[PDB]
A paper describes a structure:
Ser70 in AtAcnX may be sequentially homologous to Ser642 in mAcn, which functions as a general base; the purified S70A mutant is almost inactive and brown in color, similar to the wild-type enzyme. Therefore, to obtain a more-detailed understanding of substrate binding, we elucidated the crystal structure of the S70A mutant of AtAcnX in complex with C3LHyp at a resolution of 2.0 Å using a co-crystallizing method; this structure had a similar conformation to that of the wild-type enzyme in the apo-form, with an r.m.s.d. value of 0.4 Å for 559 Cα atoms. This mutant enzyme had the same [2Fe-2S] cluster as the wild-type enzyme, and additional electron density around the [2Fe-2S] cluster was clearly modeled as C3LHyp. The carboxyl group of bound C3LHyp formed hydrogen bond(s) and/or salt bridge(s) with a water molecule (Wat16), the side chains of Ser293 and Lys530, and the main chain nitrogen atoms of Cys71 and Ser293. The nitrogen atom of C3LHyp made a hydrogen bond and/or salt bridge with the side chains of Thr72 and Asp203, respectively. The C3-OH group interacted with the Fe1 atom and side chains of Glu292 and Lys530. The hydrophobic side chains of Trp35 and Ile206 interacted with the C4-C5 backbone of the pyrrolidine ring of C3LHyp, which may explain the extremely poor utilization of 2,3-cis-3,4-cis-3,4-dihydroxy-l-proline (C3LHyp with the additional hydroxyl group on C4) as a substrate. Ser70 was clearly the first candidate as a general base because when the structure of the apo-form of the wild type was superimposed onto that of the holo-form of the S70A mutant, the side chain of Ser70 was close to C2 of C3LHyp (a distance of 2.7 Å). Therefore, we propose that the dehydration reaction begins by the abstraction of a proton from C2 of C3LHyp by the alkoxide form of the Ser70 side chain, similar to mAcn (Ser642). The Fe2 atom, which exists in the [2Fe-2S] cluster in the Fe3+ oxidation state, acts as a Lewis acid that accepts the electron pair from the leaving hydroxyl group on C3.
Author numbering: 11 to 569
The structure:
Amino acid sequence: PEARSILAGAAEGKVIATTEALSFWGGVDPATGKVIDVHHPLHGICLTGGVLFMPTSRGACTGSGVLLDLILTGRAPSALVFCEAEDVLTLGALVAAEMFDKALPVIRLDTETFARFSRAAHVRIDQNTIKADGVSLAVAPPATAHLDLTDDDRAMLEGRDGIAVRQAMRIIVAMAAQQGASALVDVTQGHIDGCIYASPANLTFAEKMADMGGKVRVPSTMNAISVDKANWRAQGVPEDFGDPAARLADAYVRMGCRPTFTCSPYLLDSAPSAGESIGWAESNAVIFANTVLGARTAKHPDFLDLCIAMTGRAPLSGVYLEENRRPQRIVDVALPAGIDDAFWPLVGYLAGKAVPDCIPLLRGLGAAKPSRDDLKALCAAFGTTSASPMLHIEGATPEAGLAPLETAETVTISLEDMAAGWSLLNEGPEEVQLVAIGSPHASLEECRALAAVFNGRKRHADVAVIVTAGQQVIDAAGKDGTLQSLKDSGVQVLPDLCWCSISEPVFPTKTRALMTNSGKYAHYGPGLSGRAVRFGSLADCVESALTGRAVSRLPVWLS
Ligand SMILES: O=C(O)[C@H]1NCC[C@H]1O
Ligand code: FES
């Protein structure tokens, strides 16, 4: 029996337990504290005041901002209890303690005690004990850092570079300690993800850092934001939402971040190369950078991305170290005939469910030669159901030859698993009023593939077709004629926004059901939008747009 203090504090309340990880962004509504992940066992439960037992987190880096807002409003759970390593929620609780004077206790239990305490009705937490229904267990004090700090590190910690840089280093050093790191590491560039207006606290944190003089030290790009920056007012986004959403993006631009406003920064000319140590947030971008590009970055939670960008330093832990990039589980993936584009996001989705807390190696798929866009959609879906910052695909990704860990077990993803996943992501009617493409932001190749399927035809007037992409890709599609061909088919191409941050009336209010080819938005979409969401191929979506209807059936490779 072992209880370990991760973050100190005292709490008490009803046990809310689960064996499946939850992403607080997209899975918890900051307005109510209710679970909105329609595929999670806790869907509908309000977590406010409860003691949340779950093995670890999964999915989005933005959970840190959602949790912080929940702590600032009083709708957060009273405590968090894990049984494995965790970063996103712990970081959000650590920011709350460091900068907002709010303590949320976070405890990690051994797996046996986690299950035992999961069945309890009530839990109390104090700084020395955890008791579940009349059995008190001692809580070991937090791990204190065996951290090496350079002279420049200690100068930053001391305030030599101002208070903003100091607060940034304090958070980095606290994170390195809880990750058991023995040093920090230089990063060459950043990618900020907390620029999505996921909660009022996302703005509050950014304006606090910016008001202390925060500024980035390495070149740093920006993820998707919550307004079409140049057009949201003409678009009719309410001033109560669009004004803080625009000020959030403005705060990071003030701090020196490049206004790329895209969740596919690996498509930019500034994309990192193999072996390069970067510090990125946004789950799909982190996984793509490690998996496909071979660059190196942990899955940094929101807020921590800014601190890393401000100091040029990240904790030397996780996938920054070569040994931690070795496969930790083997997944034999069935290879049916007649694969189309929808295969790869489904495979990523199911791989995350099967491997939610370690780095898998997908075997059996190399000869299918997935495209860069296939791998992009795969990593995005994998970054929905798993916490891992990277994966490997045998015969496809550049590090797939690394020796698996001596402890790697072998599991499979069957055709039966795929048929189950397909129906799961297809809980909706056949009528649709919207086709949603571009989560993560569409590449130029994807915009060209979409145009090819449309084949010069125009969408049914009943079915809006919206593509979200980065500004640089839209500019490139404007120059090669792809953009005009899409507008000729009635397709609206939006910059800056993504499906994770879109809102009404840019998201058309008349929508009742939408179809998407994104495994990621298929999962998050129902709880984010309130609409029904269908998942399908690129051509499934286009046929939906041309006819007005998306037929409910398993695809060719599933027959
Ligand atoms: O890391 C993630 O997955 C989240 N960042 C912003 C939106 C969502 O993608
Ligand atoms: S912001 Fe979540 S994938 Fe675009």
